[PDB]
Amino acid sequence: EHQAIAKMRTMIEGFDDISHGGLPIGRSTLVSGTSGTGKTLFSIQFLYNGIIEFDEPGVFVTFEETPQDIIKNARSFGWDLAKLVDEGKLFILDASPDPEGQEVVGGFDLSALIERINYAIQKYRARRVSIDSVTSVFQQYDASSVVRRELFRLVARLKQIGATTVMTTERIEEYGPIARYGVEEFVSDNVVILRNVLEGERRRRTLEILKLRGTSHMKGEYPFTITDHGINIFPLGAMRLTQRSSNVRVSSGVVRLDEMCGGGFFKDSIILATGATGTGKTLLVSRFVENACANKERAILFAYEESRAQLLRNAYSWGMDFEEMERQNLLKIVCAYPESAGLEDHLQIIKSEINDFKPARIAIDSLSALARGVSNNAFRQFVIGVTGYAKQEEITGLFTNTSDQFMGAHSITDSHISAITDTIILLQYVEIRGEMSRAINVFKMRGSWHDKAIREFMISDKGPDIKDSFRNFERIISGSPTRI
Amino acid sequence: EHQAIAKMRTMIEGFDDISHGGLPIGRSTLVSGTSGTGKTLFSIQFLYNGIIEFDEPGVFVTFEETPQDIIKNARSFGWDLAKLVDEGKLFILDASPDPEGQEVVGGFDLSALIERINYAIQKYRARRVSIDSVTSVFQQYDASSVVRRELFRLVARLKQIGATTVMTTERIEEYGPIARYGVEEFVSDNVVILRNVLEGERRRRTLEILKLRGTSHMKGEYPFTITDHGINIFPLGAMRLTQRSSNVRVSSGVVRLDEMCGGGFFKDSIILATGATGTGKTLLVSRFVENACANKERAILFAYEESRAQLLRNAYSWGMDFEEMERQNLLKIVCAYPESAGLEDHLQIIKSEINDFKPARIAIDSLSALARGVSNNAFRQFVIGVTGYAKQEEITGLFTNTSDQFMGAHSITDSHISAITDTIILLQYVEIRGEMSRAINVFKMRGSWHDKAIREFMISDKGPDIKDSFRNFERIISGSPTRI
Amino acid sequence: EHQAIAKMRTMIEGFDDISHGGLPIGRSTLVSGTSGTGKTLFSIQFLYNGIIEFDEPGVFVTFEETPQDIIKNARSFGWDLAKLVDEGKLFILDASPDPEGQEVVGGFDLSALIERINYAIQKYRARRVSIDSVTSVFQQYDASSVVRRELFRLVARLKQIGATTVMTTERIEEYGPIARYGVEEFVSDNVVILRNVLEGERRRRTLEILKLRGTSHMKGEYPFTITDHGINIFPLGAMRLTQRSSNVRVSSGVVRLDEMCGGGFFKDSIILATGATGTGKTLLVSRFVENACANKERAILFAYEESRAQLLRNAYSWGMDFEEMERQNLLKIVCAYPESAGLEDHLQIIKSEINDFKPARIAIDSLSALARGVSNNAFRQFVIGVTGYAKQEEITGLFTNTSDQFMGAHSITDSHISAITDTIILLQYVEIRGEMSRAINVFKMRGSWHDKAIREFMISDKGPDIKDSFRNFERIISGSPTRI
Ligand SMILES: Nc1ncnc2c1ncn2[C@@H]1O[C@H](COP(=O)(O)OP(=O)(O)OP(=O)(O)O)[C@@H](O)[C@H]1O
Ligand SMILES: Nc1ncnc2c1ncn2[C@@H]1O[C@H](COP(=O)(O)OP(=O)(O)OP(=O)(O)O)[C@@H](O)[C@H]1O
Ligand SMILES: Nc1ncnc2c1ncn2[C@@H]1O[C@H](COP(=O)(O)OP(=O)(O)OP(=O)(O)O)[C@@H](O)[C@H]1O
Ligand SMILES: Nc1ncnc2c1ncn2[C@@H]1O[C@H](COP(=O)(O)OP(=O)(O)OP(=O)(O)O)[C@@H](O)[C@H]1O
Ligand SMILES: Nc1ncnc2c1ncn2[C@@H]1O[C@H](COP(=O)(O)OP(=O)(O)OP(=O)(O)O)[C@@H](O)[C@H]1O
Ligand SMILES: Nc1ncnc2c1ncn2[C@@H]1O[C@H](COP(=O)(O)OP(=O)(O)OP(=O)(O)O)[C@@H](O)[C@H]1O
Ligand SMILES: [Mg+2]
Ligand SMILES: [Mg+2]
Ligand SMILES: [Mg+2]
Ligand SMILES: [Mg+2]
Ligand SMILES: [Mg+2]
Ligand SMILES: [Mg+2]
Ligand SMILES: [Mg+2]
Ligand SMILES: [Mg+2]
């Protein structure tokens, strides 16, 4: 690796990519954020992984949380630090005050502390050190100048010993100064900022490596989630554009359509189905799913508009029995409101379910539903994310999109995802003789030829029946054609 | 223990969903909010439910409000604490100052206080403790650093006694620091934020669990309302997408309509009637209510546009007698201006009326009326609300929508709810031979077949007469056809 | 007293509707706001209304203004305080400092005053007290901490005393902290905020009951005014949708029009005349107002576009004499530019005059003129106000609206009021053979059946003459027809 600085791996999903390999060894990383951002979690996970993956003893210095609590809280992610303390791989160095205390101590303690820590490190042959809430130590009565010396002194001796350190710091504003005293930022070798931005009553956690003296790294903010497994990062912009592509074809579930697509959809492709309410995107999805099961293949249907029940009532009405699909353990239906969590979550949920089910086909009914509230920029990042995972996973995926206006829609999508998709399937109403008839169309395909006709189609208990084109009409797209 | 972190239930409607079980046992939780946000209410309702639901004795430490008052006010919600005091189930520890104050009390009190609290905890075998305004205590002449210690101490000692406590703190900026000294947030293991956000002369009460060291919890803000039954929170993002579905139909009040819908509306469905003013949605709504009492069933009509008297005058003129409807106790008309309150409130009023009247059918005349002033995201949240609640209750609901523009409308809804609804009914004006005639169209029906025609219809004393389509016109969807 | 919180009416118009009863008895209510928000006025009008409505003596404690001025000023609203002081009903407890003095007199008088006050309370059998500018007292040299103690002592004492008080406080920002020391907020049992919101060089006073401990109240801000009869608040959200409705008919003033509305306008209804400039709204208004005089009924015409003198001319050129109308005291013209006062002030002026002339009919020439500048929500809130009052007052109302664009207007009103109105009349230009001809059209009626034809009409010295429809045309609504 062409980087001048030797790094250690956090083994924290996504972090090592963001930091181009992990935390510089022998240095210290300031990890700061507002309340409940995941600082303690980040540092504990840092020592944990260190012990489990590389047998690297760790020293956890705590200034506010009690050693029992640090061990009790860790059980939230099924981590047993008590077992590690007994094995002598983890040492929690208690430096929290006692509920009786006095006044004055943040100085010689800084010298006593260093000596304490050098003892633990030497005794336990420690390779990693995280210092949780150093902020609270000189949070006794100090100014910025006194803080710079004490921190620098701490960091400096830690570097002499050779310990790779992680120091947590608190902030009050999500975007203003990096840390409380506006001094930590510059004493540290590297700086990580954990945010938890509000905006729209939802909460989005992001991680940012602001600086790493010596090497490069990914810049900006990256979304993450805390789970029963700790921190989980998606470097959405680290996603390389090297997806495998094959000319393999797969049916859509509708024979006539497959012809229209010049032999069916591609396996390695993303399909977009757009049209106004009532056109039949939801239907098309059903048929897309069923076909994956009719060939003994798994498929997931992430529904964001219809209940699990309704999805069954309507599917049966179109024939195709979903009950059996789930029993045979070939079709897995999800279902959840887009307002039940921000995009990151939705993205992460979609991924796990893709891992705990090895789907060959996936269907997200209504991206345009996920687009509610969120800003366009946030949505497209979401669309690149789903769309990208699916691609690198040889997982054919059909996406749905309802257009904000029936008849007259000038754009295939109000979100402008169009270029992100390989094959687009357009549905639309046609006002013919006082009636609302449907018309299906294969607008585009990248590897195939595809039919260029705008066929009309009817929906029956049997399903979608693709008929013929309105040859004798003008302005079909307008929605209100003229008979010529 | 060798497991995660046990939680205690607060029985506060909604909160135990948001917290994934309730408050972390053996720990304290900082509940802070600006003036009048519900901090005290929350703390009394935490003790109260702990007594009345599990018989867990409670201690209430008060620092400003007098014990007599605290009991006086609880009456507001039909809470008799004085009774619980006598039964030794609840103990109100008066720590409030006397009208003849004295200097320096930042230590004697700290341990003298715990001494008392502990004494009380042991005496009444209290399981719950809630302290009101710990803020006021060091509001004598202290700085953040001194504040941090005192809380660290108060919090630490309570832990030792093993008390599951609720601590109240006051703010000053709805989105400024979480608490008065920007320190409390980091000392507490758990933090709850209660907000009374202004915005457009209206106030919206929300609740957020910023963090609970040790476990998971729903993130973000959640709207709640303080009623005669205390705090009521609506985790609008917790409602699952597991609504029950069936092929059971229900008439509309319009037989020709029922025909166009393939045999009537589904009971388990959401219908939406859109069109310009004058087309006839308020009509379709009455014709809906009636049909619910002719089959001796109970229905509620939430009107926000026309008064109660008018709804009657116009209903009689269409025939159907609303008078009898009410007497027979099968029909209940509410009526109230959308400006009379905020969305959160309206949503609740809708629900409580559904509970006290066991409705079969429900209709909201003009969702678009409720969309006045309020942002779009707030509205959809409302629509998802009243919509899913109905869906899961087996309630057949009809929702009215008045598109901003007569003729030319390119979208069924300006708000864009058309995708959350099951069946869409479209009314529109059609300029014919210098005349303004109507038309009706069953735009979409998820489970049924429904008529695809745009039938013209007249309105008389008898009601709505759905005639034929204009099979000899072009561009009818535009309002100004072209005879051919 | 083991009952809910009992309140005491302030008799301040509107306040008792918002506060669900009035100020809670025996408790102190904080009332703060920026300079000149009506603070003093409030407390004072609180002690007055008491003396004159329930003969409850009152004690007024002033710390800055002199008793002479407090009385001299009250004269601004026709309140002879001087008299009430004599009749021992009101006692003004001067507590203002003199041009000379000393210092180091902190809580010294705070204790002495709580006596002087108790004195006058018993001495005059006082039930209501009001302390104007408590803030100015510790505005000598205190910190937030010293302020919280002094206020708690005072409030506590007055509470023991059993007095129902109103304490005045000053703010510096309309939307920042509640009171100067951000401490009063929490010390008070009730907090009311008076705001004098600037915004576009226009000032809008609003009052808000932030909290009332132990009881319910209306949330949010509320516009109010300061007139010669004291504070006047309009609970526009409190107005119920319980308006009386009848099938009585009345005449538009245009026979042919009445026929079209199927027998005329309903007495209990609101008519909206919509059209581009020149169409003729001011004509219908003229005609509508004249008709109420022909039947010796009183009617008011609130003109916001044309002057008194001009209305006369143009109306005499149409026949109808407005001169006699006024002599016969059957017609009352108003006239004022919308720019001569905020919506709040207009709405009131509209109401006051309706009370000083018992109108049976009402005409507002150009709602769209009142819509100038003001935001859309602030407008609808004015429409609903005027619309409602008229409605519950059995007064027939005709409101005019000029659409922003002539020909092609795709919406009746730009402000969207159309769903707030019972009867919609639509005037429009029709380009036929290179000439601009008119057309009248009864868009909708909630009771009657009305005509659906779009009839062209012409204006002469006789007034409006409704002719025929354009049966042989196409795209009339558009304004640029096509003959078939
Ligand atoms: N199993 C879990 N799943 C999801 N979230 C969790 C889980 N366990 C803890 N959390 C969340 O992790 C956060 C706890 O923060 P954490 O313990 O990482 O330290 P911190 O927020 O950085 O600092 P502080 O000590 O000031 O709270 C909380 O927001 C909490 O809800
Ligand atoms: N049994 C059936 N027989 C005939 N037509 C049906 C039947 N079921 C559904 N349909 C038709 O299909 C439409 C249902 O739309 P569908 O579920 O396919 O998804 P969509 O229109 O793409 O998206 P959305 O959920 O927004 O409606 C109805 O509007 C209706 O015309
Ligand atoms: N029965 C009730 N129904 C509706 N709202 C009520 C009722 N009783 C009280 N309220 C409202 O509840 C709020 C009272 O807040 P509460 O006393 O619980 O705590 P706080 O204001 O956050 O803190 P503190 O009381 O110590 O100042 C006020 O907004 C009040 O008007
Ligand atoms: N007795 C009647 N006979 C014939 N037509 C009537 C009668 N009453 C009302 N109408 C017609 O019905 C329409 C009334 O509309 P309705 O009250 O049904 O609700 P809407 O148009 O959907 O919404 P809103 O009128 O509140 O804006 C009028 O436009 C009118 O043409
Ligand atoms: N007759 C009146 N008509 C219209 N406005 C009036 C009349 N009398 C007084 N006002 C207005 O009323 C307000 C008087 O405010 P007031 O003295 O009651 O309280 P304040 O200014 O809020 O606080 P403080 O007087 O303690 O400084 C001013 O804005 C003034 O212009
Ligand atoms: N004596 C008259 N003879 C013929 N037509 C007249 C006469 N007076 C006015 N008109 C016509 O009536 C129109 C006057 O409009 P009017 O006063 O009725 O109000 P408006 O058109 O509704 O609103 P606005 O004030 O914006 O013009 C003129 O544009 C003109 O065509
Ligand atoms: Mg934190
Ligand atoms: Mg921490
Ligand atoms: Mg769908
Ligand atoms: Mg309280
Ligand atoms: Mg309407
Ligand atoms: Mg209506
Ligand atoms: Mg849709
Ligand atoms: Mg002033």
Ligand SMILES: [Mg+2]
């Ligand atoms: Mg308070």
Ligand SMILES: [Mg+2]
């Ligand atoms: Mg005019």
